[PDB]
Design a protein around this ligand. Structure first.
Ligand SMILES: Cc1c(-c2ccc(Cc3ccc(OC(F)(F)F)cc3)cc2)[nH]c2ccccc2c1=O
Lengths: 46, 99, 65, 445, 239, 379, 196, 413, 74, 59
């Protein structure tokens, strides 16, 4: 129904990490999930 | 030596410096020049791209830079020489080999 | 019947540029008409005169028509 | 047991006010969990050039200790009660809030109050958060979406405070003293500019009380001389074209000037935007997608992604689209997108407007799910509209829009109007402004 | 062979937007009629051409009726002679060039249709020739019937001074001085050679006005479109 | 896709050649001349076709049919004078066009350039045969003199001339065939001009700096569509100023007395745009020598690229060259003047000097100028 | 940062309507567009005017010239054709017949049994004045010229294939399919007929 | 209104809270995750997830898209290792249109050769995008390293198999895994009576190995200047009491940020690591738990050159928890965090649907939140030290990605 | 070659205004006049000399032709 | 009230269809106005000279 939070372009250079303040919240904690949709950009979760 | 009088004169009369161009920006591109340009590092390419972009945009407006901004005769480093010299030196060699 | 043309040709004739040119006319008039055995003529001097006369005539004649 | 009905018995929002003028807003349900916090009419639009990104600087400092809880005391205490403490700054709105056990609402509201009012802003903590912003600024440089949008603003509202980025220029980050921060704070963080909003299991009455208990010291005294007012912001039809052929994909962002928060036209525009829609290469839809922009982009690999937006500021906004595409496709993306604006403007169908309606109905109903979205809707609505608009009101404005409205409204903003364009990356193909501008009308209409 | 070029007389039609004086043409026509028609021809002008220019339809019909012209055959196979219509051209003096030479001592009188156009100097030149006839300069003996005119090439012409005072009475009663007679006939010989003159100049003025409108308009359209690029500022912001 | 502009086999071609074509940002007014030449060509063809609806190529009727156009055909005059001043405007546009090419070194685009040389030659052939069709004095006598030059050629020369003529003199056949050639050639010009652009669009345009422009290209539409309209508008002002205020200015009076194989006009000379090469012919005393000089005075154009010595492409940054070029221009203006004068003193000498100066500038001085300039940059 | 990019000052270039940075451009949007499109629209009206004239002339050229118009009509003095006589003229390179019909011939063509005619065209449907019948001297069969006052109907007779015509110029006998052609004419007075 | 629950004779669960909201979420949950792929059809379930909206018997591919979109609806398909979840959302008045679609997609896909062929490249795109998150590399690797079968299966189809998943495999997979005995149909904003009746009439479909933990390591050498690394031992299975112990141990040690831009002053691991090494880094306890098995450990993100120090530091912190250092205040914090986390996770009507349906498969019925918090309280400090003890002495699985030149091997640790 | 495949360019920003936000003739005479003069000076000593020379060769030659066609006083 | 150029825009120039109808109408009027007005300018400049002026003397 709603568009996703970070849209998904393939072939598009990655966003950088240059401090602890951006890193924390990255370390994985639960197993993987994958959703695909009709509307909403496809994403991968812990 | 003593012709350096004319050189400095010719330079200012020629007048490409008024567009912030350096001498090698003005070199007409044949195949040797193309290769030499192709062999320039990021820094030197990007500068050339800019200086021309700058100059062409000035050409379109029918203007020149402020005199402070003009390429000073002495500050005109001959950036393309090393690359071009070798591009040519190389070609002359394969030409020789074809006999 | 007076022609305005011959009026103005007179009027113009009394100007320094004209009077000097007809003097040029008259010198050779009584140089060739005085000398004999001389095939040289004097159109050139008449034309000098007419050029300067008729320039002036032009400037003023059409007024009368 | 119908939809029309369902709307009717959604919990109402409680609206109250303190002496100083702090508004207190609440929506309640039988809920073990809640969210509460402070929304403030403060951001970059309120900053000058000399103190730009102060609001952002503070955001870094906000959770770093208070006078009552110095250093990591505030952190530890939120952590140990299982609470989640969070913040955000836009060009118009700051917001700090806390996700908590319903039972811990009191301490929740105490803590929020400790952050806003009695913020330490330690010398060394400033100098540490100084480097951090600089590095965040650097990471942000490698986000093309981020950059293109910053640029759209910068060129759209050039020579105003809306042209300003939230984060501030690096020059400021490097130079902003602790003096500048405390001055910014006292000038902008005032009770009539602020709203305390909460959702979950909480009797409204309790919140209002608690508001009094901890937010009573908040000042509402702008002397006549220095009353922060938002001068309108002039939009300019313009282009900013940062060409960097070295990057793999082109970002383009193009907008006309939108009406801004207040205006009812926003509703019909949202309908129209939903028609045109959004896309990326991960979508199931393909050719069969409903939106012609989406189906055409999909079938012909024009772009990797796109969204329509309609960003609202005070009395202005950015209504447009952003797309990310191959360096060869910028022309074809721009042509179909502008094509679409014209088709709605001139010749929208009923069925497709019905679709737009249904999308937007669905959109904002399922958005407001769980306490944080709802808490925020309260907090922000109070700042933007001066009130929470009930869902049933949204639905009344939505039912109102037909084909005729979508045509008229879209024509007002899109048809034969100057856009602002930002492109970033290998944009050598990205069409010339004159060509883009001529693409805003049909010589057939 | 020196050369004296004519001076540039301030004609009623000299200027950019100046028409021919049509009353002058009507007189000048008559100076062809009564004087040159005998010697010269004017093949490209017919009786009709005068209508709406110097003569009414009916006047021009009468002028046409006043002349003989051959027509035929009739069914018997004979060429007869008849009164002119508007559709008849101004009729030639002789049957051919050779016959015309016989009549004028070897000289062929040029057709006058285009004479203003076909001689450097135009009406200035013809007017100077007609009024410039003079006695030779001293030193000069022209041959037989080779009269002296200072404006003719080689300075010797085989045409007797054709105009003099009162060589005709004008329809409108203008005092027929030699100069006036030459002015008028030149005005007509202008129109002979270039009937478009007036219409052309009308178009001139309307063109100058339209261009006056469109040139700055279109220039502004150009500057408008181009202003996107003209204004633009560049920045090289290398990493 | 849906851009029919890019899709449709026919529209694709127009889109690529007139709309989305990358043109340099900075091209000057000297680049307008291509467009303007096109317009001149269409202009000639329309006016030409309309004149041909009323003209006849029989020697007896020919002169009369043209005057018939100018007297009795509705607006025949404005059509005829437009066609004749249009031929002038063609040559002005051509010479400015070629001038641009020389100064800015556009001739480096060799196929484009040579096709240009062919185009030039063809328009010359067209305009030569055009001026004959009225069948006035200068038409007829001009045509006799020039054509005849071919007789200078050893052996075959004299035959070839009578073969062009179709008889022992410029008469019936000559005109009737000159009508046909004159009619068909513009169409061939049309074709060759398309080949001209076919080559152009492989590289796209040069620009005044002479420096490659792919860093600052703009689409032809709207920038150059708007400029062309403006250009064309200024072209139409030039044309109509001649046609409506001075139609006879650029031609010759003798072309208003019919062609007479007896009476020879005082100073026979072709129309102004040949006068420079007419003078070059008259420099050289020997006839075959003067034919080969007049031949070389045009074909030398196809030599210009080989003679190029500068390391820089354009003359913009090249002062000596600029001067020699402006010399060469003024010299050409002198040859034009000299060509219109009688073959007498002092014009004979001036001419000789001018003709020497012409070939000297192209073959020797301007190449040298190039190398000096170079040595002065330490090129 | 990219956040250090600020857009240059365009004030020098701007319209005064949009110089005021704290006001909405949306006021002047109606107007600024108006001024610009007016220039466009005005220009088009100018060029319309021109193209009309240029096209109009070129089309005119192909319409009949002054000389073709001058052989368009013919002026025939009626008082020069006596009663009973057929006078022929030359018109459009064709013989043109103008006949003074007598009191007798008027009554005779009016009484003509019309349903016997190969080509009807009643007399009063072929004339303006009954004493005058104007016809082209071109026989409708194979284009010969009929001779006045011969044949079975005392009108015209064409010797080529035996075409007999009456005093209204109607076909009555022979192979001719149509009546002799009636030209466009008018009487400009009691004396004058203008054919053409 | 509170939750209703049904288990038909055919094995199928229906659970549904009618809450009279304006929106209706329905979810069909199926034991059809990646784990039920064998070594022959690896990647089939991934194609199957991309494959909704492909023609069905009752609706065209066009109709599924256009129809759902018409009403503002949404259809999504989510996969873990153990289940797949087909979810429809819509305004409440259109549940039976979306329900028609849901049934068609799951009970009667046609999987036509041309459609299925056409869709293959989506595997590359989908996977490609997904693997942009480095956490996805490491977790997929981790499972591969730790298991010999089933739970080792990547969720994303292996490269070799792209272009090669057949119609027949898709049919086989649905026919053998999408069965009444394997499915739970969950709902908000819908009456239980008519869900039951739908499930009886349309979801009555006839029915159809243990995951052996192995312990290995897998190391992607790739030269980023950050090294992602995860170290785990076998944890307890979901549904067991011991599993609650692990959840608590996770939250003692530290499992995610609470305050934005915060220092995580209560996170035991974060602090353990922050003392050793100062430059950009992050660490969390990693806790997975499945029907057969579980993995518990930690995930580091460290500078390439400090990966050694960070992993060792982190492991050491677990060792002192396992030795015995653990005060009630810490375990109280951990429980409060966990308790708060659980309630918050089921706060949205979205997360709730995931819990209801999630439990419905892996256990008998719905456990109310109140019972669950009680079960977290039921964890003794004793059980937490056992969880840590189990981890330190358990056989290890490891996975790393980055410039691994200073990343230790398992045997190096 | 089509827009999109012309050349490689890196790190160049271009700011520009819509034609409807700006004027066609900013500082048209104020700036125009001096720029024309600058331009005129810059080329005059390269362009003008040859035409001066033409003027001279021309006016000399013309009246030399006239003079030589007069009679000589001897 | 917004300005006159603005009135012109919203009434005549926004819809391309009205823009074109405007052009054709305006051209019709421009045509006659300009023809009539410019002819005046020509005929005054050439007072008494034109057949149109001296017509009356022979009728
Ligand atoms: C193509 C091009 C032009 C350019 C050339 C001509 C015209 C007017 C014109 C002439 C002949 C025509 O006949 C045709 F093609 F239709 F069959 C049509 C139109 C207009 C423009 N001008 C340029 C200017 C600068 C750089 C490039 C070009 C160019 O490529």
């Amino acid at each position: 129904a709603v568009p996703a939070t970070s849209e998904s372009p393939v072939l598009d250079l990655k966003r950088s990490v240059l401090c602890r303040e951006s890193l924390r919240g990255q370390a994985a904690g639960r197993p993987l999930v994958a959703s695909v949709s009709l509307n909403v950009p496809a994403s991968v979760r812990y | 030596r003593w012709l350096e009088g004319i050189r400095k004169w010719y330079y200012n009369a020629a007048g490409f410096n008024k567009l912030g161009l350096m001498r090698d920006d003005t070199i007409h591109e044949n195949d040797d020049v193309k290769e030499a340009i192709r062999r320039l590092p990021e820094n030197l390419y990007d500068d050339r791209v800019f200086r021309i972009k700058r100059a062409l945009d000035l050409s379109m407006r029918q203007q020149i830079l402020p005199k402070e901004q003009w390429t000073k005769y002495e500050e005109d480093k001959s950036y393309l020489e090393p690359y071009l010299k070798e591009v040519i030196r190389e070609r002359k060699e394969r030409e020789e080999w074809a006999k | 019947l007076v022609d305005p043309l011959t009026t103005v040709r007179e009027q113009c004739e009394q100007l320094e540029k004209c009077v000097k040119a007809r003097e040029r006319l008259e010198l050779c008039d009584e140089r060739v008409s005085s000398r004999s055995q001389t095939e040289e003529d004097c159109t050139e001097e008449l034309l000098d005169f007419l050029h300067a006369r008729d320039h002036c005539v032009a400037h003023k004649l059409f007024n009368s028509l | 047991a119908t939809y029309a009905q369902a709307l009717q018995s959604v919990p109402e929002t409680q609206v109250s006010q303190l002496d100083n003028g702090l508004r207190v807003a609440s929506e309640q349900s039988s809920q073990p969990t809640c969210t509460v916090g402070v929304w403030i009419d403060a951001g970059s639009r309120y900053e000058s050039e000399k103190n730009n990104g102060a609001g952002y600087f503070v955001e870094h400092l906000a959770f770093k200790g208070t006078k009552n809880r110095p250093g990591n005391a505030l952190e530890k205490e939120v952590e140990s009660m299982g609470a989640h403490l969070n913040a955000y700054s836009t060009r118009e709105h700051t917001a700090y809030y806390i996700k908590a056990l319903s039972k811990d609402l009191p301490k929740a509201v105490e803590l929020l109050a400790d952050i806003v009012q009695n913020c330490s802003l330690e010398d060394s903590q400033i100098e540490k958060e100084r480097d951090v912003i600089l590095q965040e600024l650097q990471e942000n440089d490698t986000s093309m979406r981020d950059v293109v949008f910053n640029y759209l603003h910068a060129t759209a509202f050039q020579g105003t405070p809306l042209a300003q980025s939230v984060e501030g220029p690096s020059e400021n980050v490097r130079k902003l003293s602790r003096a500048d921060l405390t001055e910014y704070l006292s000038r902008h963080y005032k009770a009539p500019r602020m709203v305390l909003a909460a959702a979950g299991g909480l009797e409204h009455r309790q919140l209002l009380d608690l508001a009094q208990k901890h937010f009573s010291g908040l000042s509402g005294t702008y002397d006549e001389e220095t009353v922060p007012t938002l001068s309108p912001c002039r939009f300019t039809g313009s282009q900013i074209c940062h060409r960097e052929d070295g990057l793999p994909l082109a970002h383009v962002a193009i907008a006309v000037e939108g009406p801004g928060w207040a205006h009812p036209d926003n509703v019909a525009l949202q309908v129209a935007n939903a028609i045109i829609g959004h896309y990326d290469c991960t979508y199931g839809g393909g050719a069969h997608l409903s939106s012609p922009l989406a189906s055409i982009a999909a079938t012909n690999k024009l772009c990797q992604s796109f969204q329509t937006f309609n960003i609202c500021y005070a009395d202005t906004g950015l209504l447009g689209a952003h797309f990310v595409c191959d360096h060869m496709s910028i022309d074809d993306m721009m042509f179909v997108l502008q094509g679409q604006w014209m088709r709605l403007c001139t010749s929208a169908t009923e069925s497709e407007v019905l679709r737009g309606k249904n999308l937007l109905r669905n959109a904002l109903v399922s958005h407001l799910d769980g306490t944080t979205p709802v808490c925020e809707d309260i907090g922000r609505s109070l700042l933007t509209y001066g009130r929470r608009i009930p869902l049933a009101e949204w639905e009344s404005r939505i039912a109102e829009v037909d084909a005729r409205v979508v045509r008229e409204v879209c024509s007002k903003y899109f048809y034969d109007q100057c856009p602002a364009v930002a492109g970033f990356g290998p944009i050598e193909q990205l069409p010339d402004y004159n060509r883009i501008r001529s693409g805003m009308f049909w010589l057939r209409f | 062979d020196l050369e004296l070029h004519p001076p540039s007389y301030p004609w009623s039609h000299r200027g950019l937007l100046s028409s021919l004086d049509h009353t002058s043409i009507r007189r000048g026509f008559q100076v062809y009629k009564q004087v040159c028609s005998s010697c010269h021809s004017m093949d490209y002008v017919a009786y009709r051409h005068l209508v709406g220019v110097c003569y009414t339809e009916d006047e021009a019909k009468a002028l046409a009726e006043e002349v003989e012209v051959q027509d035929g055959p009739n069914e018997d196979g004979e060429m007869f002679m008849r009164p002119g219509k508007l559709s008849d051209y101004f009729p030639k003096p002789y049957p051919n060039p050779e016959a015309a030479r016989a009549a004028n001592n070897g000289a062929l009188p040029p057709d006058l249709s285009y004479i203003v156009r076909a001689r450097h100097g135009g009406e200035d030149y013809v007017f100077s020739l007609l009024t410039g006839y003079c006695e030779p300069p001293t030193g000069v003996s022209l041959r037989e019937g080779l009269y002296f005119n200072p404006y003719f090439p080689g300075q010797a012409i085989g045409m007797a001074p054709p105009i003099y005072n009162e060589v005709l009475e004008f329809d409108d009663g203008t005092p027929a001085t030699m100069s006036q007679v030459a002015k008028d006939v030149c005005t007509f010989l202008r129109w002979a050679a270039e009937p478009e003159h007036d219409h052309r100049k009308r178009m001139g003025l309307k063109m100058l006005l339209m261009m006056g409108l469109l040139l700055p308009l279109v220039y502004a359209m150009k500057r408008h479109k181009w202003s996107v690029l003209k204004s633009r500022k560049l920045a090289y912001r290398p990493p | 896709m849906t851009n029919i502009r890019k899709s449709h086999p026919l529209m694709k071609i127009v889109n690529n050649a007139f709309i989305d074509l990358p043109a340099p940002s900075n091209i000057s007014s000297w680049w307008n001349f291509g467009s303007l030449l096109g317009i001149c060509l269409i202009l000639q063809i329309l006016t030409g076709l309309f004149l041909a609806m009323h003209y006849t190529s029989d020697t007896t009727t020919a002169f009369s049919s043209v005057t018939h156009i100018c007297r009795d055909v509705n607006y025949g005059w404005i059509i005829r004078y437009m066609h004749a001043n249009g031929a002038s405007m063609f040559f002005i546009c051509l010479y400015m066009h070629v001038g641009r090419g020389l100064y800015y070194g556009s001739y480096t685009f060799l196929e484009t350039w040579n096709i240009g040389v062919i185009l030039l030659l063809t328009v010359m052939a067209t305009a030569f045969m055009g001026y004959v069709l009225p069948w006035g004095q200068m038409s007829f006598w001009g045509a006799t003199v020039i054509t005849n030059l071919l007789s200078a050629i050893p052996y075959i020369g004299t035959n070839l001339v009578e073969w062009i003529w179709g008889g022992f003199s410029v008469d019936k056949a000559t005109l009737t065939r000159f009508f046909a050639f004159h009619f068909i050639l513009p169409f061939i010009i049309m074709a060759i001009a398309m080949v001209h652009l076919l080559f152009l669009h492989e590289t796209g345009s040069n620009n005044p700096t002479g420096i490659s422009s792919d860093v600052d290209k703009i689409p032809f539409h709207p920038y150059y569509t708007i400029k062309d309209i403006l250009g064309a508008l200024l072209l139409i002002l030039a044309l109509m100023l001649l046609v409506l205020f001075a139609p006879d200015l650029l031609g010759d009076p003798d072309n208003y007395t019919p062609a007479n194989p007896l009476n020879t006009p005082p100073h026979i000379k072709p129309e102004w745009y040949f006068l420079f090469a007419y003078a070059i012919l008259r420099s050289i005393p020997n006839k075959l020598g003067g034919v080969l000089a007049l031949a070389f005075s045009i074909l030398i154009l196809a030599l210009i690229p080989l003679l190029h010595t500068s390391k820089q492409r354009s003359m913009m940054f090249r002062p000596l060259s600029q001067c020699l070029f402006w010399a060469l221009v003024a010299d050409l203006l002198t040859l034009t003047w000299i060509g219109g004068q009688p073959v007498e003193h002092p014009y004979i000498t001036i001419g000789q000097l001018a003709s020497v100066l012409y070939f000297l500038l192209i073959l020797v001085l301007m190449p040298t100028a190039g190398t000096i300039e170079n040595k002065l940059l330490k090129w | 940062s990219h956040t250090d990019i600020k857009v240059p000052d365009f004030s020098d270039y701007r319209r005064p309507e949009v110089l005021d940075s704290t006001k909405s451009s949306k006021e002047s949007s109606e107007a600024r567009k108006g001024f610009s499109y007016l220039v466009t629209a005005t220009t088009t009206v100018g060029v319309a005017y021109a193209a009309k004239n240029v096209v109009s002339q070129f089309v005119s050229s192909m319409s009949a010239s002054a000389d073709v118009l001058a052989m368009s009509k013919i002026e025939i003095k009626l008082s020069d054709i006596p009663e009973g006589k057929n006078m022929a003229f030359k018109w459009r390179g064709k013989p043109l017949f103008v006949r003074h019909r007598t009191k007798k011939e008027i009554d005779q063509e009016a009484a003509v049994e019309v349903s016997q005619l190969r080509d009807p065209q009643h007399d009063l449907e072929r004339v303006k004045k009954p004493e005058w019948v104007i016809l082209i001297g071109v026989c409708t069969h194979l284009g010969c010229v009929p001779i006045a006052n011969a044949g079975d109907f005392g009108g015209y007779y064409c010797p080529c294939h035996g075409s007999h015509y009456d005093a209204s110029g109607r076909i009555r006998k022979g192979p001719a399919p149509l009546n002799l052609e009636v030209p466009s004419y008018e009487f400009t007075s009691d004396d004058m007929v203008i054919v053409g | 209104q509170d939750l209703e629950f049904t288990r038909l004779p055919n094995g199928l669960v229906i659970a549904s809270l009618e809450n009279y909201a304006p929106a209706s979420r329905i979810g069909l949950f199926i034991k059809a995750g990646s784990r039920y792929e064998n070594s022959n059809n690896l990647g089939t379930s991934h194609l199957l997830r991309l494959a909704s909206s492909l023609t069905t018997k009752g609706a065209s591919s066009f109709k599924i898209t256009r129809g759902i979109e018409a009403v503002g609806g949404k259809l999504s398909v989510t996969s873990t290792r153990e289940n797949m979840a087909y979810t429809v959302e819509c305004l409440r008045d259109d549940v039976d249109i979306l329900m028609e679609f849901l049934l068609n997609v799951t009970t009667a896909p046609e999987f036509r050769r041309w459609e299925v062929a056409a869709l293959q490249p989506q595997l590359r795109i989908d996977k490609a995008v997904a693997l942009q998150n480095p956490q996805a590399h490491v977790i997929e690797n981790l499972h591969a390293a730790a298991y010999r079968n089933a739970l080792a299966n990547s969720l994303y189809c292996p490269d070799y198999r792209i272009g090669k998943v057949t119609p027949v495999e898709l049919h086989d997979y649905v026919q053998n895994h999408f069965t009444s005995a394997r499915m739970a149909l969950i709902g908000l904003g819908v009456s239980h009576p008519v869900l039951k009746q739908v499930a009886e009439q349309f979801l009555n479909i006839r029915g159809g190995a243990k995951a052996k933990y192995h312990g290995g390591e897998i190391r992607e050498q790739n030269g980023d200047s950050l090294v992602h690394a995860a170290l785990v031992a076998e944890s307890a299975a979901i549904g067991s009491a011991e599993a609650n112990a692990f959840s608590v141990l996770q939250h003692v040690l530290g499992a995610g940020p609470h305050v934005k831009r915060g220092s995580n002053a209560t996170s035991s691991l974060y602090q353990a690591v922050a003392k050793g090494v100062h430059q950009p880094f992050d660490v969390s306890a990693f806790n997975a738990s499945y029907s057969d098995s579980g993995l518990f450990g930690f995930y580091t993100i460290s500078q390439a050159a400090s990966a050694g120090d960070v992993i060792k530091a982190a492991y050491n912190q677990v060792k002192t928890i396992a030795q015995g250092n653990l005060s009630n205040p810490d375990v109280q914090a951990a429980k409060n965090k966990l308790k708060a986390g659980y309630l918050m996770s089921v706060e949205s009507s979205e997360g709730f649907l995931d819990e209801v349906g999630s439990q419905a498969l892996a256990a008998g019925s719905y456990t109310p939140p109140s019972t669950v918090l009680q079960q977290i309280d039921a964890v003794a400090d004793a059980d937490v030290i056992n969880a840590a003890k189990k981890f330190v002495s358990g056989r290890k699985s490891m996975a790393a990605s980055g410039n691994l030149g200073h990343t230790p091997f398992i045997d190096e640790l | 070659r089509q827009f999109g495949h012309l050349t490689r360019v890196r790190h160049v920003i271009t700011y520009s205004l819509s034609p409807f936000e700006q004027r066609a003739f900013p500082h048209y005479f104020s700036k125009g006049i001096p720029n024309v003069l600058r331009r005129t000076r810059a080329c005059i000593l390269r362009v003008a000399p040859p035409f001066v020379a033409f003027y001279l060769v021309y006016t000399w030659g013309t009246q030399e032709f006239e003079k030589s066609k007069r009679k000589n006083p001897a | 009230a917004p300005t006159l150029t603005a009135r012109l825009y919203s009434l005549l120039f926004r819809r391309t269809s009205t823009f074109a109808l405007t052009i054709v109408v305006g051209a019709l009027f421009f045509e006659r106005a300009f023809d009539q007005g410019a002819d005046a300018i020509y005929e005054h400049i050439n007072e008494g000279k034109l057949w149109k002026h001296i017509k009356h003397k022979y009728e």
